[PDB]
Short mmCIF file of C-alpha atoms and ligand atoms in Angstrom, two decimals:
data_model
loop_
_atom_site.label_atom_id
_atom_site.label_comp_id
_atom_site.label_asym_id
_atom_site.label_seq_id
_atom_site.Cartn_x
_atom_site.Cartn_y
_atom_site.Cartn_z
CA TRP A 1 0.00 0.00 0.00
CA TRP A 2 3.08 2.28 0.58
CA UNK A 3 4.07 1.97 -3.10
CA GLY A 4 1.94 3.84 -5.73
CA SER A 5 1.36 2.51 -9.24
CA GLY A 6 4.31 0.37 -10.57
CA UNK A 7 4.43 -2.05 -13.52
CA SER A 8 0.76 -2.40 -14.48
CA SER A 9 -1.09 -2.44 -11.19
CA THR A 10 1.68 -3.92 -9.06
CA UNK A 11 0.68 -2.65 -5.60
CA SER A 12 -1.40 0.35 -6.45
CA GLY A 13 -2.17 1.68 -3.01
CA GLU B 4 -2.36 9.19 -29.52
CA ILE B 5 0.67 7.44 -31.21
CA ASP B 6 0.41 4.18 -33.29
CA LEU B 7 2.13 1.09 -31.70
CA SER B 8 1.38 -0.80 -35.01
CA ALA B 9 3.83 1.61 -36.80
CA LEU B 10 6.79 0.03 -34.86
CA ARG B 11 8.73 -2.71 -36.80
CA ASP B 12 10.87 -5.59 -35.32
CA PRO B 13 14.47 -4.74 -34.23
CA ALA B 14 16.39 -7.98 -35.19
CA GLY B 15 18.69 -6.56 -37.94
CA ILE B 16 18.75 -2.92 -36.60
CA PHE B 17 19.97 -2.95 -32.92
CA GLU B 18 21.73 -5.69 -30.82
CA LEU B 19 21.61 -6.18 -26.98
CA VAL B 20 25.05 -6.52 -25.22
CA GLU B 21 24.66 -6.65 -21.35
CA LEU B 22 22.23 -5.91 -18.42
CA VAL B 23 22.20 -2.40 -16.73
CA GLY B 24 19.01 -2.36 -14.52
CA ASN B 25 15.21 -1.71 -14.22
CA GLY B 26 13.39 1.51 -13.10
CA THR B 27 9.77 0.24 -13.63
CA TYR B 28 10.95 -3.42 -13.03
CA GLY B 29 11.51 -3.66 -16.84
CA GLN B 30 15.04 -4.70 -18.02
CA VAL B 31 17.61 -2.24 -19.57
CA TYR B 32 20.52 -3.49 -21.79
CA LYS B 33 23.56 -1.69 -23.34
CA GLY B 34 22.18 -1.69 -26.94
CA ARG B 35 24.46 -1.29 -30.02
CA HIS B 36 23.46 -0.07 -33.55
CA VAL B 37 24.55 -2.86 -35.99
CA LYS B 38 25.74 -0.81 -39.05
CA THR B 39 27.32 2.28 -37.31
CA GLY B 40 28.30 0.72 -33.91
CA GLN B 41 26.86 3.69 -31.88
CA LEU B 42 25.77 2.80 -28.27
CA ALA B 43 22.23 3.47 -26.89
CA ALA B 44 20.33 2.31 -23.72
CA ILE B 45 17.42 -0.06 -24.75
CA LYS B 46 14.62 -0.60 -22.13
CA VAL B 47 13.02 -3.99 -23.09
CA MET B 48 9.49 -4.20 -21.51
CA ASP B 49 6.43 -6.51 -22.06
CA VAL B 50 3.42 -4.75 -23.74
CA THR B 51 -0.24 -5.66 -22.83
CA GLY B 52 -3.53 -3.71 -22.35
CA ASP B 53 -2.50 -3.28 -18.65
CA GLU B 54 0.65 -1.40 -19.87
CA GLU B 55 -0.59 0.52 -23.02
CA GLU B 56 -1.36 3.45 -20.58
CA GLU B 57 2.28 4.11 -19.44
CA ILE B 58 3.52 3.33 -23.04
CA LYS B 59 1.09 5.88 -24.64
CA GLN B 60 1.98 8.69 -22.13
CA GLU B 61 5.76 7.97 -21.64
CA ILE B 62 6.62 7.86 -25.43
CA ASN B 63 4.70 11.14 -26.15
CA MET B 64 6.64 12.69 -23.16
CA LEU B 65 10.07 11.65 -24.63
CA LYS B 66 9.14 12.68 -28.24
CA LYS B 67 8.34 16.22 -26.85
CA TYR B 68 10.95 16.89 -24.10
CA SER B 69 13.96 14.43 -24.31
CA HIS B 70 15.70 16.88 -26.79
CA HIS B 71 16.97 18.80 -23.66
CA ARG B 72 20.62 17.82 -22.82
CA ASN B 73 19.66 17.42 -19.08
CA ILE B 74 17.29 14.54 -20.19
CA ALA B 75 18.52 11.25 -21.79
CA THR B 76 17.40 11.64 -25.46
CA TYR B 77 14.79 9.20 -26.95
CA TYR B 78 16.07 7.63 -30.24
CA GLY B 79 12.82 5.64 -30.81
CA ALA B 80 10.99 2.30 -30.24
CA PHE B 81 10.66 -1.25 -31.75
CA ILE B 82 8.10 -4.04 -31.00
CA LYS B 83 9.65 -7.56 -30.96
CA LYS B 84 6.59 -9.78 -31.84
CA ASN B 85 6.72 -13.34 -30.32
CA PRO B 86 4.56 -16.50 -30.92
CA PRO B 87 0.91 -16.78 -29.71
CA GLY B 88 2.06 -18.54 -26.47
CA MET B 89 4.30 -15.53 -25.54
CA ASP B 90 4.13 -11.71 -24.91
CA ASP B 91 5.24 -8.81 -27.23
CA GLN B 92 8.51 -7.07 -26.09
CA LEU B 93 8.68 -3.22 -26.45
CA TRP B 94 12.21 -1.76 -27.00
CA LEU B 95 12.76 1.90 -25.91
CA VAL B 96 16.07 3.20 -27.43
CA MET B 97 17.68 6.06 -25.41
CA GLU B 98 20.89 8.16 -25.09
CA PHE B 99 23.35 5.75 -23.31
CA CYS B 100 24.58 7.26 -19.97
CA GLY B 101 27.81 5.21 -19.58
CA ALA B 102 28.66 6.29 -15.96
CA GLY B 103 25.31 4.94 -14.60
CA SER B 104 23.11 6.50 -11.83
CA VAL B 105 24.06 9.01 -9.05
CA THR B 106 22.99 6.33 -6.45
CA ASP B 107 25.63 3.90 -7.93
CA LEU B 108 28.30 6.70 -7.89
CA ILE B 109 27.44 7.18 -4.14
CA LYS B 110 27.65 3.38 -3.36
CA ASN B 111 31.00 2.87 -5.23
CA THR B 112 32.42 6.05 -3.49
CA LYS B 113 34.51 5.70 -0.24
CA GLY B 114 32.32 6.92 2.71
CA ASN B 115 29.26 7.13 0.36
CA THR B 116 29.41 10.99 0.04
CA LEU B 117 30.23 13.66 -2.65
CA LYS B 118 32.14 17.03 -2.51
CA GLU B 119 29.59 19.91 -1.97
CA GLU B 120 30.54 21.50 -5.38
CA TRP B 121 29.42 18.15 -7.03
CA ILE B 122 25.96 18.23 -5.26
CA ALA B 123 25.47 21.94 -6.25
CA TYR B 124 26.38 21.07 -9.93
CA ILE B 125 24.10 17.96 -10.28
CA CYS B 126 21.23 19.84 -8.46
CA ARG B 127 21.56 22.72 -11.03
CA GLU B 128 21.41 20.28 -14.03
CA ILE B 129 18.33 18.56 -12.43
CA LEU B 130 16.73 22.00 -11.65
CA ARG B 131 17.29 23.08 -15.32
CA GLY B 132 15.75 19.69 -16.31
CA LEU B 133 12.70 20.29 -14.01
CA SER B 134 12.32 24.00 -15.11
CA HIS B 135 12.13 22.76 -18.77
CA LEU B 136 9.44 20.13 -17.83
CA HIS B 137 7.57 22.47 -15.35
CA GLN B 138 7.18 25.29 -17.99
CA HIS B 139 5.68 22.59 -20.35
CA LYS B 140 3.16 21.60 -17.55
CA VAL B 141 5.02 18.25 -16.98
CA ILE B 142 5.67 16.69 -13.49
CA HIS B 143 8.34 13.89 -13.23
CA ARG B 144 6.73 12.60 -9.94
CA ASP B 145 9.69 10.19 -9.17
CA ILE B 146 12.88 12.35 -8.80
CA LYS B 147 15.71 10.51 -6.91
CA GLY B 148 19.37 9.38 -7.46
CA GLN B 149 18.37 6.18 -9.42
CA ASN B 150 16.66 8.40 -12.09
CA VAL B 151 19.62 10.91 -12.37
CA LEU B 152 22.22 9.43 -14.81
CA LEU B 153 25.80 10.49 -15.78
CA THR B 154 27.63 10.26 -19.17
CA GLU B 155 31.36 9.27 -19.47
CA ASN B 156 31.83 13.13 -19.69
CA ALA B 157 29.77 13.66 -16.44
CA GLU B 158 26.86 15.70 -17.95
CA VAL B 159 23.61 15.06 -15.96
CA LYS B 160 20.66 13.32 -17.78
CA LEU B 161 17.23 12.54 -16.13
CA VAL B 162 15.51 9.19 -17.07
CA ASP B 163 12.25 7.23 -16.35
CA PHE B 164 9.09 9.23 -17.36
CA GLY B 165 6.94 6.11 -16.56
CA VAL B 166 4.95 7.76 -13.67
CA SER B 167 5.16 11.34 -15.16
CA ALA B 168 1.99 13.53 -15.44
CA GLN B 169 0.98 15.83 -18.37
CA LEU B 170 -1.58 18.60 -17.55
CA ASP B 171 -3.86 20.41 -20.10
CA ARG B 172 -3.77 23.64 -17.96
CA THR B 173 -1.17 25.45 -15.83
CA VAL B 174 -3.66 26.00 -12.99
CA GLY B 175 -4.11 22.16 -12.88
CA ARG B 176 -3.30 19.82 -9.92
CA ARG B 177 -3.02 15.97 -9.56
CA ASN B 178 -4.36 13.49 -6.89
CA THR B 179 -2.47 10.27 -7.67
CA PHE B 180 -0.47 8.78 -4.78
CA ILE B 181 2.75 7.87 -6.70
CA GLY B 182 6.62 8.00 -6.54
CA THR B 183 9.13 6.53 -3.99
CA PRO B 184 8.17 6.98 -0.27
CA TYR B 185 11.48 8.54 1.03
CA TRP B 186 11.59 11.11 -1.86
CA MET B 187 7.75 11.73 -1.81
CA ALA B 188 6.48 15.21 -0.70
CA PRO B 189 3.80 15.55 2.06
CA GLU B 190 0.93 16.79 -0.24
CA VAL B 191 1.65 13.65 -2.42
CA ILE B 192 1.54 11.37 0.72
CA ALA B 193 -1.83 13.12 1.55
CA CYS B 194 -3.40 11.58 -1.66
CA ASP B 195 -3.07 8.03 -0.08
CA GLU B 196 -6.22 8.18 2.17
CA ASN B 197 -7.86 11.64 1.53
CA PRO B 198 -9.37 11.93 -2.02
CA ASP B 199 -9.57 15.80 -1.68
CA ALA B 200 -5.71 15.92 -1.38
CA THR B 201 -4.21 17.47 -4.59
CA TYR B 202 -0.58 18.51 -5.50
CA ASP B 203 1.36 20.07 -8.45
CA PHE B 204 4.91 20.72 -9.89
CA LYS B 205 6.03 21.68 -6.30
CA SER B 206 6.34 17.89 -5.47
CA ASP B 207 9.45 17.43 -7.75
CA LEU B 208 11.27 20.32 -5.96
CA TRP B 209 10.90 18.48 -2.58
CA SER B 210 12.17 15.19 -4.18
CA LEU B 211 15.24 17.24 -5.36
CA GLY B 212 15.92 18.36 -1.73
CA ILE B 213 15.76 14.67 -0.61
CA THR B 214 18.04 13.67 -3.58
CA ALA B 215 20.40 16.55 -2.54
CA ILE B 216 20.50 15.07 1.04
CA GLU B 217 20.86 11.56 -0.55
CA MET B 218 24.09 12.84 -2.26
CA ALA B 219 25.42 14.37 1.05
CA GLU B 220 24.70 11.69 3.74
CA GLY B 221 24.75 8.69 1.29
CA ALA B 222 20.96 7.96 1.57
CA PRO B 223 17.65 9.87 2.07
CA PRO B 224 16.26 10.83 5.53
CA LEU B 225 14.35 7.95 7.28
CA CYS B 226 16.25 5.33 5.10
CA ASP B 227 16.60 3.16 8.29
CA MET B 228 12.73 2.95 8.56
CA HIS B 229 10.19 0.78 6.63
CA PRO B 230 8.77 2.89 3.73
CA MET B 231 5.21 2.69 5.23
CA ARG B 232 6.62 4.46 8.39
CA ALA B 233 8.60 7.20 6.53
CA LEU B 234 5.11 7.78 4.94
CA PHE B 235 3.48 8.43 8.40
CA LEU B 236 6.66 10.37 9.47
CA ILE B 237 7.33 12.81 6.53
CA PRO B 238 4.12 14.89 7.15
CA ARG B 239 4.56 14.75 11.01
CA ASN B 240 8.38 15.22 11.49
CA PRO B 241 10.23 18.57 11.12
CA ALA B 242 11.27 19.02 7.41
CA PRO B 243 14.66 17.23 7.05
CA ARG B 244 18.00 19.16 7.45
CA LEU B 245 21.67 18.07 6.88
CA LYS B 246 23.35 15.90 9.61
CA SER B 247 26.96 17.27 9.26
CA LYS B 248 27.57 21.07 9.72
CA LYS B 249 30.80 20.77 7.59
CA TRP B 250 28.56 21.83 4.60
CA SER B 251 28.23 25.57 3.59
CA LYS B 252 25.53 28.01 4.90
CA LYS B 253 24.06 28.40 1.33
CA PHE B 254 23.70 24.56 0.87
CA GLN B 255 21.95 24.45 4.33
CA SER B 256 19.56 27.28 3.17
CA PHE B 257 19.03 25.48 -0.23
CA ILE B 258 17.87 22.19 1.46
CA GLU B 259 15.95 24.60 3.82
CA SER B 260 14.23 26.18 0.72
CA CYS B 261 13.49 22.85 -1.13
CA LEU B 262 12.02 20.97 1.90
CA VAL B 263 9.13 23.30 3.00
CA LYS B 264 6.04 21.21 4.04
CA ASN B 265 3.37 23.73 2.82
CA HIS B 266 3.49 23.71 -1.05
CA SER B 267 2.01 27.28 -0.93
CA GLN B 268 5.09 28.31 1.19
CA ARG B 269 7.48 26.13 -0.95
CA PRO B 270 9.19 28.19 -3.72
CA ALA B 271 8.62 27.48 -7.47
CA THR B 272 11.40 26.14 -9.82
CA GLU B 273 12.04 29.62 -11.38
CA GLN B 274 12.94 30.85 -7.82
CA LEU B 275 15.20 27.81 -6.95
CA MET B 276 17.40 28.80 -9.97
CA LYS B 277 17.84 32.28 -8.32
CA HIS B 278 19.14 30.76 -4.99
CA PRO B 279 22.83 31.46 -4.10
CA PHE B 280 23.62 27.66 -3.96
CA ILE B 281 22.46 27.45 -7.66
CA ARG B 282 22.66 31.00 -9.21
CA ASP B 283 26.41 31.38 -8.27
CA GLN B 284 28.24 28.13 -9.36
CA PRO B 285 32.10 27.90 -9.41
CA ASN B 286 31.98 27.06 -13.19
CA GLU B 287 30.07 24.46 -15.32
CA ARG B 288 33.35 23.15 -16.92
CA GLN B 289 35.38 23.45 -13.61
CA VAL B 290 33.16 21.04 -11.54
CA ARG B 291 32.27 18.74 -14.53
CA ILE B 292 35.96 18.08 -15.51
CA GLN B 293 36.58 17.49 -11.73
CA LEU B 294 33.54 15.11 -11.31
CA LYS B 295 34.44 13.39 -14.66
CA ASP B 296 37.82 12.32 -13.13
CA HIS B 297 36.19 10.71 -10.00
CA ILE B 298 33.69 8.61 -12.09
CA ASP B 299 36.73 7.72 -14.32
CA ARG B 300 38.61 6.55 -11.13
CA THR B 301 35.57 4.76 -9.53
CA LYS B 302 34.60 2.78 -12.73
N1 ADN C 401 19.64 5.93 -20.82
C1 ADN C 401 20.05 5.09 -19.87
N2 ADN C 401 21.36 4.77 -19.80
C2 ADN C 401 21.76 3.92 -18.84
N3 ADN C 401 21.03 3.30 -17.91
C3 ADN C 401 19.73 3.63 -18.01
C4 ADN C 401 19.18 4.49 -18.94
N4 ADN C 401 17.81 4.60 -18.74
C5 ADN C 401 17.57 3.82 -17.71
N5 ADN C 401 18.69 3.20 -17.22
C6 ADN C 401 18.75 2.28 -16.09
O1 ADN C 401 17.47 2.18 -15.51
C7 ADN C 401 17.49 2.66 -14.14
C8 ADN C 401 16.22 3.42 -13.83
O2 ADN C 401 15.46 3.70 -15.00
C9 ADN C 401 18.78 3.48 -14.04
O3 ADN C 401 19.26 3.53 -12.70
C10 ADN C 401 19.71 2.72 -14.98
O4 ADN C 401 20.32 1.60 -14.36
#
């Protein structure tokens, strides 16, 4: 949850 | 809107040589042009419908802005098309930055620190980079040492426009919780829980402060904490300062100007150029030749 977006929704909040 | 169909297969054009890293957890090789021999960084990704959002935006960003010498230039793209039981592999071809990242420079450097003149130089290059993007209504949204690259000649080139934001208007704000926790600004961290929370170009300028500190102390503030804690901390704690007082008064006031919690209070990019730490620089050639030699020693 601490990481926003990333490689196509990989942990996206 | 740019056509992905337009892109041909790269077999007989460019050739991969060796691994270099991943910013968006997509591989990056030291590409070589077959006929001429010229070097270029090639980011090999996997393209889907999940990804054709970042690929649309990012490419348009590079086509428009990469021309700037402070940003690694975009040469173009190729789609490597694989069998039905496989995934298509995008190639992004880019100005090769042969000295690697700032963060790697720091790690390979005795005591993981840089001479204050070096920090003030790299910061200026970045700031010129940001001022170019900010005037064009573009936010980088993930400024840090891993995304600041160095050429064999030690000129500073920004990379990774994957999580960048284009705005139609200059009055416009964003509300997307994004970037790297340690380097993230408070008004960005606010967008995690509260949907009313919005931010703008000011966010990058904070990330620069934290990068600046990264270059001094060898890592960002709160690096010894879990990211999810730094998150809770950054809004609550007093805006980070330098540890050592062996740095100059100007540098202390620079960091002190960058890292202002309230983004109303926080200066704009155009101002940060006018700051003593930036405005008055020993000489662009004087520091660069110097910094060139240290990279060239620490290869
Ligand atoms: N143009 C480039 N030249 C060299 N390495 C690059 C380039 N673009 C991206 N990278 C690699 O990807 C990482 C983050 O995008 C960098 O730290 C670096 O290792």
